[PDB]
Design a protein around this ligand. Structure first.
Ligand code: IPE
Ligand code: IPE
Ligand code: IPE
Ligand code: MG
Ligand code: MG
Ligand code: MG
Ligand code: MG
Ligand code: MG
Ligand code: MG
Ligand code: MG
Lengths: 328, 342
């Protein structure tokens, strides 16, 4: 997560913009604006994770400036996929802002054009893959991984939507089993599996059992990341309560609620009125969810640490500890 | 040919496509929902793109190679084009604020869909690559086919963006509504995915990779594509929604349609000022004032002359096709769409 790692990664971004525009002009001019607004925002943890994965998997003699740059181009393809997913999500959730910026669809003379922009950005990453990877053995595996992860992410987004009806949350749907499945499909595949598997393919590591071993730990890391994120939304302005999100806090609240407290969740969860958010926050404090999170965090850390030490098939343990360090 | 027999053969593959994409055993709620998404959105069209893929292959491949298995592969490729079509229409209806598609309420208008249609759009598009992986991953044509879908997808998104830049600040950019702009929109928005994609897929499955052969096909199929979209633009204003299965929104959405471009070419100053005032308005009475102007300018008659003359011009260009391309494939495509009312 160092400043020098960020600068190395950002140095590639102008080339990505040139590749997808310069390299019908009013569309290409506009698309340069789409890319610069939506793609290089946030901390770029997923793109940087792709570069770090490659650096810790590849043979030192192969870690040339050229090959490290290729890993960066792969990282930007992950950031292109994310940008597409978040443009769509912000449209679907009718959100006002993301990471301090207005949601792309809310910008002047965007509106419903954000729908095509979402698909355009997703489509663009396969142009980048063709330009830089078409001559390599990792080309087809990388293409198939992106298509597979995109499909799985759409399945996650749909499962998330099946926890809401007529603008209200369906609290009967808020089970730990459904929560775990939403996090796995909607977040963990594209956030954790995709960067590491891309690093492995670029380092010409194709053993399916290596990818399966990596997947097992990265799905556990992914679940912790999202539970910590859900916790910090309320206790870390967080809008999960107002939005009626199937968050870990809401799932555990319903597990620990008596009938009177279940009725409070029924009446007040996913309501825009200021009194509702405050009533839910008060209930979360009353149910001792911060204390419950602290216990979960310790147990999960020790289980994941143990599982990383057990990773077989000659994978570097240090890669998973560096990722797991960044989360915790 | 586009016969009942060919249609039955093609439709028979659809259940296998749904099974392949839905039957992730830890999330059965979502896999069953996706079966519904596919059943609603994919197979109730005319399926001309899908059937065109099969016909292209059958006329390009060496007769001895046309096994039941190889003809079914062409059919599966056809359904991959129909999956792309399905995803584009889901997204398009949301963007074009449309009421009906293929005789039914648009997917996004279904009670608890709305903007979730954007996710279903991305999902259906992604799904075609799973189908390609299952059936084509072991064949030499796999990477060319993947790269064609990728490139056509990208080009179509570019076309849809140029189509959507018809308006800024709620008013149409009528000064920019030229036949040059129109030809650019339709080439990227329609021609590549509707005509080039099916034929190129047929060529690739028949292991025909000669770039000159693809370039020869491209030249004619871009002409056929423009013709097809001009027909679609006409049906938007003057078609029967009971036959087309859709309600037109081009006037209301201020689209750079063939009708709008030709109307501005034929308009006197007073008629130009009616377009300036009433084109691209949400009010229904403004849509009627534009349709009235189209009628007064004789655009129905102008369209009929264009369609007949273009049919003859394209048929003349098909006769001049070289590079061992079967002329009859292109005649069959033009015969299928000439004077269509849907
Ligand atoms: C990858 C996708 C689809 C983003 C989902 O984010 P959520 O809607 O759950 O939460 P926000 O990041 O919008 O707060
Ligand atoms: C490119 C355009 C005009 C979209 C509709 O295509 P069709 O008119 O072929 O639609 P379906 O048969 O698939 O319903
Ligand atoms: C990329 C696509 C789907 C082309 C749609 O063009 P239109 O917007 O004119 O299509 P219809 O709604 O008339 O079917
Ligand atoms: Mg959201
Ligand atoms: Mg969401
Ligand atoms: Mg959050
Ligand atoms: Mg948010
Ligand atoms: Mg439309
Ligand atoms: Mg449209
Ligand atoms: Mg139309």
């Amino acid at each position: 997560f160092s400043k020098e790692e960020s600068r190395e990664f950002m140095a590639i971004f102008p080339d990505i913009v040139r590749d997808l525009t310069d390299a019908i002009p009013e569309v290409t001019k506009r698309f340069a604006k789409v890319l610069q607004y939506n793609v290089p925002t946030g901390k770029k943890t997923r793109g940087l994770s792709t570069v770090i994965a490659y650096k810790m998997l590849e043979k030192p003699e192969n870690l040339t400036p050229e090959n490290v740059r290729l890993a960066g181009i792969l990282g930007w393809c992950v950031e292109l996929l994310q940008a597409s997913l978040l443009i769509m999500d912000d449209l679907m959730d009718r959100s006002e802002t993301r990471r301090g910026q207005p949601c792309w669809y809310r910008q002047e003379n965007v509106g419903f054009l954000a729908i095509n922009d979402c698909l355009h950005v997703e489509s663009s990453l396969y142009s980048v893959l063709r330009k830089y990877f078409s001559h390599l053995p990792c080309y087809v595996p990388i293409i198939e991984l992106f298509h597979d992860v995109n499909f799985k992410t759409n399945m996650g987004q749909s499962l998330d939507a099946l926890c809401m009806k007529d603008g209200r949350p369906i609290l009967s749907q808020f089970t730990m089993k459904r929560y775990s499945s939403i996090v796995k499909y909607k977040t963990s595949y594209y956030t954790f599996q995709l960067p590491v598997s891309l690093g492995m393919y670029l380092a010409d590591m194709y053993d399916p059992e290596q990818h399966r071993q990596a997947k097992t730990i990265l799905m556990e890391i992914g679940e912790f990341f999202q539970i910590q994120d859900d916790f910090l939304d309320a206790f870390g302005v967080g809008t999960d309560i107002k939005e009626g999100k199937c968050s870990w806090l809401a799932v555990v609240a319903l597990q620990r609620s008596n009938p009177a407290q279940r009725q409070i969740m029924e009446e007040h969860y996913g309501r825009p009125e200021p009194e509702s958010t405050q009533i839910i926050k008060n209930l979360y404090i009353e149910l001792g969810l911060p204390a419950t999170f602290a216990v979960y965090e310790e147990e999960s850390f020790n289980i994941i640490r143990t599982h990383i030490h057990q990773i077989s098939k000659g994978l570097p343990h240090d890669l998973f500890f560096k990722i797991m360090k960044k989360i915790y």
